[PDB]
Write a protein that binds this ligand. Structure first.
Ligand SMILES: Nc1ncnc2c1ncn2[C@@H]1O[C@H](COP(=O)(O)OP(=O)(O)O)[C@@H](O)[C@H]1O
Ligand SMILES: Nc1ncnc2c1ncn2[C@@H]1O[C@H](COP(=O)(O)OP(=O)(O)O)[C@@H](O)[C@H]1O
Lengths: 260, 260
């Protein structure tokens, strides 16, 4: 294959940034989006998108829209409509501050075959090549038998693996600083996880599901070369350091980093 | 090529039914959908969809959502969000009466190259093969230079031409009985138009734009074998005759038929 230089010293070629629904919605409130949170995140995502023009996707968690859309197995089709709404809210906000943000329906581009997502549309690569920011989300995907399955926003980065050349960095922003070991309301963050043998990270989740889906996806991505992070999102936080080699990140940043 | 039997005696293999925004919305009222009209059309479309299971698409006009979305050339991106909403309203209504209706974002599946729409996603054919009803609409499409263009719902049938095997029937339901000749508020319907030389139909539109886009699309489709109709939609009308060979249609039906 092509030898790809990789390491903590290296700059990513591509950023897949996933923003958790817990950060901008409330499950106690169907389709409450927090517009202030969306507004402030959007400003920080826009700076990333300018640097990584054509080299970034933003993936939204389904939040309140999602959880109600999966709360007659064709009834899951409603999910694609609920996640489109969230994409629309991000994209609208981004375009309002000068970003060329375009929502794409993953269900129109991707199907499942033997449980593995298959990118079936060339449009995503074209949109990136034109310098636009795809806004993606979880979705209802058809499998090879015609059955719909809820495909989490956390697994969307897996879809990029065959498409992205060079070094992919995947960042999953959530409401915790990473994978915590020793307690549900517990003890320290696991800073590093080796995707080749991540048994200790899975063991920490048992100690205290959503997080299990995240780990599964980011291990999958890391086993194909990606550098992956689970870390805390905050609408007003500067994110410029996500452009930088990991060894150059500021000292205050906490995360769980998943790599091979 | 494969010789395809065709004629007024023959049954269509595929139905592309387009429902005009004038039939279920009002341009004088931004995003007024007429829910009663949607409800009643949906019942008639559901009967078609059962017969043409896996062999039909429903295409919605953009109505009030559309016209406001096209009323900073990346600002057209808002169109894809406005037409997704209309797809969602049809699909939701259809699923409520037992149809496996799934909205698909044309912009996630199709791009323009030298002005010709190019189906770039295999998902549409898969959804049909699974026996589902794609719900489609007009959209903002990217061209090969990265420019967005508003692609009318009336032109969506063109996208099906390379994909559909056998005899395609395209039916564009609007607020007039067909192409009227001799007056804006004028004289008789043109019953037949030969797509090879449709100069008389274009001349009738000058006699009294929207209709020009319809003619252009249906001539394009007819020149590749399709049997096309412009006729009046009415939410409560039975549509079962659209399953039948043209020579067997009831005598009360008025239309403009476009064929080679
Ligand atoms: N070992 C663990 N480390 C960190 N978080 C955990 C762990 N086990 C369970 N969680 C839960 O996972 C949540 C993050 O996943 P989730 O609610 O799906 O986030 P998002 O909305 O950001 O997708 C945390 O709020 C936490 O309550
Ligand atoms: N020669 C013609 N024959 C029929 N309709 C015409 C003609 N010229 C212009 N029109 C206009 O085209 C309209 C249908 O196109 P449009 O408003 O785009 O319909 P839809 O909302 O159903 O797409 C008619 O209401 C009519 O007012």
């Amino acid at each position: 294959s092509g030898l790809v230089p990789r390491g903590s010293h290296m700059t990513p070629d591509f950023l897949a940034i996933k923003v958790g629904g817990s950060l901008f919605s409330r499950k106690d409130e169907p389709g409450s989006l927090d517009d202030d949170a969306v507004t402030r995140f959007a400003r920080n995502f826009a700076r990333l998108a300018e640097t990584y023009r054509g080299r970034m996707v933003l993936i939204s968690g389904g939040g309140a829209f999602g959880h109600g859309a999966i709360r007659h197995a064709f009834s899951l089709a409603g999910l694609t409509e609920a996640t489109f709404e969230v994409k629309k809210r991000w994209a609208e906000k981004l375009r309002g501050i000068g970003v060329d943000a375009f929502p794409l329906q993953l269900a129109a581009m991707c199907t499942l075959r033997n449980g593995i997502p298959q990118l079936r549309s060339e449009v995503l690569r074209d949109v990136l090549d034109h310098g636009a920011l795809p806004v993606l989300a979880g979705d209802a995907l058809f499998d090879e038998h015609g059955k719909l399955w809820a495909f989490s926003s956390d697994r969307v980065p897996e879809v990029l693996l065959p498409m992205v050349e060079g070094r992919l960095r995947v960042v999953t922003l959530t409401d915790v600083d990473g994978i915590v070991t020793d307690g549900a309301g517990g003890d320290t963050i696991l800073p590093e996880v080796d995707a080749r043998s991540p048994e200790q990270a899975y063991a920490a989740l048992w100690g205290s599901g959503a997080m299990h889906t995240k780990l599964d996806a980011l291990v999958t991505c890391a086993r194909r070369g990606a550098e992956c992070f689970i870390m805390r999102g905050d609408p007003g936080s500067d994110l410029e350091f996500l452009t930088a080699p990991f060894s150059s990140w500021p000292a205050h940043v906490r995360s769980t980093r998943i790599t091979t």
